[PDB]
Amino acid sequence: TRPHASIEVDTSGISEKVFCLIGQAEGGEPNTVYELRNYSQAKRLFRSGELLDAIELAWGSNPNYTAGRILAMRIEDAKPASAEIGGLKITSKIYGNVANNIQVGLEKNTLSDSLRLRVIFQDDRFNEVYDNIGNIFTIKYKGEEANATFSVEHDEETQKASRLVLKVGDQEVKSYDLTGGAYDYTNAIITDINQLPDFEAKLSPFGDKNLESSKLDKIENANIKDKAVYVKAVFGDLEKQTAYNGIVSFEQLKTIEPFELTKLKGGTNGEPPATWADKLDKFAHEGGYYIVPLSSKQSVHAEVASFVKERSDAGEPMRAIVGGGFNESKEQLFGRQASLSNPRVSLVANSGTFVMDDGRKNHVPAYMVAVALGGLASGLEIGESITFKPLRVSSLDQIYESIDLDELNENGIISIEFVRNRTNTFFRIVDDVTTFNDKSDPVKAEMAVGEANDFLVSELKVQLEDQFIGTRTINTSASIIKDFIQSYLGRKKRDNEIQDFPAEDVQVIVEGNEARISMTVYPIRSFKKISVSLVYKQ
Amino acid sequence: PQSDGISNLHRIALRFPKEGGGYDMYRFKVNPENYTIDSPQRTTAIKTKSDIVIEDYGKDIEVINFTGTTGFRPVREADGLKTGKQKMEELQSRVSEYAMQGGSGNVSGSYLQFFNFTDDSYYKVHLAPQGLKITRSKDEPLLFRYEITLVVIGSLTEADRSAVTTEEFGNVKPNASQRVDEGIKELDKNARKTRDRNNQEISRRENTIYNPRQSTNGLKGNIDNMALIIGYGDGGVS
Amino acid sequence: RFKKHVVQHEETMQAIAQRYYGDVSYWIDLVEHNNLKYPYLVETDEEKMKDPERLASTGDTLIIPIESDLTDVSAKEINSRDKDVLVELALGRDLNITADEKYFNEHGTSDNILAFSTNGNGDLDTVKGIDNMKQQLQARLLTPRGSLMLHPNYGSDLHNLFGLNIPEQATLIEMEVLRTLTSDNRVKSANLIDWKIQGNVYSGQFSVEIKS
Amino acid sequence: RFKKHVVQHEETMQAIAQRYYGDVSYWIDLVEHNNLKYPYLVETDEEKMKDPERLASTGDTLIIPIESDLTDVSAKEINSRDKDVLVELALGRDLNITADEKYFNEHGTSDNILAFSTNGNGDLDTVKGIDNMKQQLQARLLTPRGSLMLHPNYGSDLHNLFGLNIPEQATLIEMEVLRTLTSDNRVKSANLIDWKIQGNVYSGQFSVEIKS
Amino acid sequence: QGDGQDFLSNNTAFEIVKVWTETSPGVTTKEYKQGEDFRLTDGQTIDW
Amino acid sequence: NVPEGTINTIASGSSLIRSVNNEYSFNTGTKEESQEDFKRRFHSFVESRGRATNKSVRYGALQIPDVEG
């Protein structure tokens, strides 16, 4: 429409990597991934429960750092609530039990010979009415023959509108095809009746209808001299009335009929699924890096762990952080670690409490502290560690203290340590050790070193690919490979992505069908032991 | 933006107060040859007999100075075809008009508004005491040169200091004071004389933003309003 | 004015006072500002059940004065009333005139736009705190500068600015927005995050530092 | 002195005083200058037909003093009744001597060229307002610098500037004309807008800024 | 007086064409049923 | 304070919950009364126990509803 200015006081939010969450929550259409870029969008795609409280925690676990964009999936096969009432299939755009609260009714107005529609739903405070359903336009004939009429005939094969005809007595004054032609939008009828001498036709003032002409209903020989009768077209008007808004949709089985204000049925979240792998398959190509399942079940932890290894074999590195239960014992934890001792997995012990922004002092299980942790770890720049970073947790339901924070960490399980003051939340996380058994190798053992390796490796792969694997010519022997690789390493040292490298310790071997490469790099990783000595001259 | 291979160059423009209210919006067709910006500090150093003392008072008035030449060849304009000499003369006439009208201490209207279309930065500025120095030497006979120096008042993002709308909750213009004063004007000279006597007696007996809610500053105004509707002595008190 | 705080695990009451005032000894004043009994903070949340209003626990919110209002008995009294609603004293309460943000955003700078409305029943809709601040920026900026029938230099020059779509003009719109928004003391400052010139649509987004 | 204005569609008398003088408070004294009855500005002309001289309606002129003369009672009394006779009194009335307008433009810088005339009946012609200025300027310009019997250094050296029509002579003539015109304090500035040559004929035109 | 009388412009009213709460003008919330919701009374009242 | 059956809703949105309602009205939200009124009423009670006094006798004559002047 016309020129104007707008100011929206946007409530959105009340950055490089991507974070993946699969869990249980009671809204959103099932078995399709979503990208969440805004908390206020998550409150509207979803509604309630762990998947949303997880996201509300992930984007707030530190006062300065925060997680990137989040990929979500719901772990339920929620049906949509629906009913067959009248001649209409009513189906709700909401999927789950919540949709059962919806109410729909219809009543016919005597003063306009049309329907009045009402839809109600409680939790969104939605309760609005649509009226004058049909009434799409009126005709009055003005010639002085005794009594004239019009007619509108269907396509009997399809129940679509076929002709509109004007009859003065027995004579067809005029007619128009409606199975497509000139008149596919109703606008051309609104000229081509008026332009004749003996007839005039005019629209209702309540909005621009201008429907597709094939949607009229079958009528024959309706008087329009004594009255300015409506053309009806009651079903197809519902789309113009309500399609773009609200919670409900309508579909036809048959004649539309009034009915009392009635509830829907069949909104069902269903049984929880016995396995998560079939839905976990969908994250395979959405571009994630860090993934957390929102459940303590051991089968889910084994499936996700095997899934991450399968992705890592296929050119996509990934890492899983997992928690377990409500305040687990050492025996349980080392039982979970021993069954799951592969790399690219990390296990978290504690179960905390968080001040959720509703004012809701939420006591929160271990697999949700894993979200708070994974969120922070995902948001930081590549090559930093969670090592000695603080977390904004309120209090802990915990056993483990300083001597246990040898035992657990030494066996490759992460835990949060209580420091009595000044460090922002009194709580910092001791290490970034993984679930792998052998700690001697730092790439396997310590998360941050792996997280720097995985993206550095991908870049070496991608840059070697188009320079050489493209096979542009064999006439480029191994001496040139040393030139390209030393140039490549020289950039990484300059860009701080590696600490340093020796240039004259590179060996290349080639046989025309295959080239072999050897190189050394000196890595960059967080300090962890500081031994500062004192001496004096007395 | 500068010419960086991603966006084309864009060139400086200066907004002036229009004498009927609103503005003129002048722009240069060749950018400056020299561009200098100074940021002096009010820090001072004094040397005591046994120690040095470092003292600072904050940021000082910045200076902007740049020098350039108006192009030779004719160039189309957003409402004409103006040559370099016409552009330079227009500039001199704007500057002359802005300087001459400031004969009341300071213009009540706008300072000059400066847009750095080249490196992203915006300032409010005033003519420096160097002024618009124009010269044309033997070298480059058909090219004019201009030298402009300015002083920065503040960032263009921030509105004027005195013009900021304060909170002003409650009532800044209380009716109690007004109707008290009207009462006391309406009193008879003897009435006010007796009120003065009562005030002096009370003073002898001393010894030997406004809001009607959640505020005590306006307590006296409610009490001062009384002692006139009620005859607390032949005249009010305080 | 004040600052919020959130109570942490086994948080020492004296640590709060030290952490925000440097000396320990002002904790006597802080606990009087917050109407606490002797158990100032407690680990167990079941203990709060007994005297909820006069007993705080982990994750509860406390009010921290600024140093100047520390010993003012009147501030102590008022700060004992507005507990976790103190924002309302700075930003204020005013009448709602944004009856539908779906309406005026599609009509923009004109006469005959906004109107009083009613939330609930009988009580006229009063819009408060941050929601007052939303309105008092929005309703200000939509008004043209000359408009209002007392205290002129209200409003903004925004309606003048529909010139040519070229980049300089876009920065001029940024400047008038910045100028208009920083004109009220309730906001510290403003700056532009991003802007987007479509073929005839300006879009841009701005930060503002509301106080508290 | 004063500024002219006109009544706009449903503009209130408050609005005018606020826009020109800043404070709305001044409208009260401002109505006395325009001698208005209570319905000071009223939209309808068939309502002005009630008692036409004591009102203003949509499309009518208004008088707007400068702020110094706003409080003067004499300015109030004079502006009340004189109305349109303001301009004439403010720029002056005197006898018309431009009797032969076709003729004096055939012999300028020669004497004996102007003469009294008669308009109306039985009274010497008089000129007023803008035409008072056209007369005096035209005469003054066509008078040599020291030829009035008192207050000499009045007039121009236009009779002395006849020369070889090279451009320096033309700029000299331009400057003399501008000095001539800018002598009267009632005129703000003059500037040339064209100078043009036709062999032995000069031609050009000047724009003068007369005070409101 | 809930469940009872409200008064017409006429005591001569004898046939009540429509009785209805207004979603807007004529656009009906409830149209009421005569002898069940309201009835005519007095020839002068809609009567609940 | 609120009458019975006024909440009708929960903010946590867990779809297991069908309906919510307070069985009894809340009436424990006592107002704030300064000790001045308490002290006044206590002093009035203490003064009303005086015997064989003009003011106490006068006060005691006021118990009958028809005794005014």
UniProtKB/TrEMBL annotation, chain B:
Residues 175-221 are annotated as: Disordered. Pfam families: Phage_tail_tube_init. It comes from the Viruses. InterPro entries: Phage_tail_tube_init_put. Residues 179-208 have a biased composition (Basic and acidic residues). This is Putative baseplate component.
UniProtKB/TrEMBL annotation, chains C, D:
InterPro entries: LysM (IPR018392), LysM_dom_sf (IPR036779), Sheath_initiator (IPR020288). SUPFAM superfamilies: gpW/gp25-like. Pfam families: Sheath_initiator. Transmembrane segments: none annotated. This is Baseplate wedge subunit.
UniProtKB/TrEMBL annotation, chain E:
It comes from the Viruses. This is Uncharacterized protein. The chain holds residues 289 to 336 of 1152 of the full protein.
From TrEMBL, chain F:
It comes from the Viruses. This is Baseplate component. It comes from Staphylococcus phage 812. The chain holds residues 141 to 209 of 348 of the full protein.
